[PDB]
């Protein structure tokens, strides 16, 4: 969570960790068949009715926000309206991220194109070289 505002932010060059060694271990055929399809399958299964993931994330987000406010030592009001507004905002953000992965393109494009775009972005050497030294972007 961002120390300035109560929001979810990763702020890293790549969306997730997929380095050359893991790709080689999986192989091209497996990476094309299993890895790409399973992410979309999970997203589609979870967000079938859109009014369930939010109900599941409500309490977790509430706890996270309360912890952030307590750590900042700046509650000073325990205002329920602010809590509700920010909790709803964070739940909406997470659900938007979940819904992005489970969308089928419009033209004659494959079913999982967003996942392939994410994989390309996460394997691009240009932005794979901007990670920290401890992250070990290589290997």
């Amino acid at each position: 969570m961002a120390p300035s505002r109560p929001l979810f932010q990763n702020t890293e060059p790549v969306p997730f960790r997929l380095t050359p060694n893991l790709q080689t271990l999986m192989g091209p055929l497996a990476t094309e068949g299993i890895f790409a399809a399973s992410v979309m399958a999970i997203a589609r299964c979870l967000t079938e009715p859109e009014q369930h993931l939010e109900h599941a994330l409500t309490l977790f987000v509430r706890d996270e926000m309360m912890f952030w406010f307590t750590n900042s030592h700046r509650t000073m009001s325990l205002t329920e309206n602010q809590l509700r507004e920010t909790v709803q905002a964070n739940c909406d953000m997470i659900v938007k991220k979940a819904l992005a992965l489970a969308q089928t393109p419009q033209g004659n494009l494959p079913a999982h194109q967003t996942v392939t775009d994410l994989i390309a972005k996460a394997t691009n050497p240009m932005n794979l070289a901007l990670c920290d030294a401890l992250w070990m972007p290589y290997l």
Binding site: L29, T31, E32, A36, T123, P125
Partner: peptide, 22 residues
Amino acid sequence: TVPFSIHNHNPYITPSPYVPYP
């Protein structure tokens, strides 16, 4: 390029880790 090779790239395919890069 190189027909019937699994290392070819295509905007609708993953890069494959046996080529320099697309």
